[PDB]
Amino acid sequence: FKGLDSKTFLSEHSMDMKFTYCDDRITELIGYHPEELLGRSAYEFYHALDSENMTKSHQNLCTKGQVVSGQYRMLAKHGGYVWLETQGTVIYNPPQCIMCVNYVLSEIE
């Protein structure tokens, strides 16, 4: 059994959804090293069956400024999928980047 902090990690993305930063906590949870994620869009990692609903959530983030994802799957480093829920927040300046708080709902399946 894991405590809440240990199932939660932060990520940052450009407005193109590419990772620009990720907490090292992801490595124990999903297997990626943060540096291998940089430059890759979140869309490279969504299960096919979640792709249309995530595209709708991204649209909503970009119109509302802040959205919770609902339950979705991320492709894990060595195959299979982890269920996550994410709260997304756009940081607008003087949009600059998206900040994500990600919470893991399952082990790798």
């Binding site: 869009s41 869309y43 490279e44 096919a48 792709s51």
Partner: protein, 110 residues
């Protein structure tokens, strides 16, 4: 029967920069749903690295054709086998960066 296919142009990273509207009949998306995204975003996880390595190598093959087969996620979230034939173009009157031209056909894996 006519095979179903459409043309796309990409930057050397893989991002769609141009999509021929035949894509609607081939994969179900409007061109605007593909423009600005990397083709890898529509690719099956088992095929994604092959697709990345194929975009890397086509720029090394002296403008010759490179083909790849991979599973593409249609607008219905179904995996469709595609055969993408790609080659680079660079206008010799310039020193502008080459881009990649692709023709994308739905094919049988058999």
């Amino acid at each position: 029967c006519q095979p179903t296919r459409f043309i796309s142009r990409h930057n050397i990273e893989g991002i769609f920069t141009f999509v021929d509207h035949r894509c609607v009949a081939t994969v179900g998306y409007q061109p605007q749903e593909l423009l600005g995204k990397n083709i890898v975003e529509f690719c099956h996880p088992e095929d994604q690295q092959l697709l990345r390595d194929s975009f890397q190598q086509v720029v090394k093959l002296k403008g010759q054709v490179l083909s790849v087969m991979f599973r593409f996620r249609s607008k219905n979230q179904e995996w469709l086998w595609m055969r993408t034939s790609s080659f680079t173009f660079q206008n010799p009157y310039s020193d502008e960066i080459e881009y990649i031209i692709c023709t994308n056909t739905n094919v049988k894996n058999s």
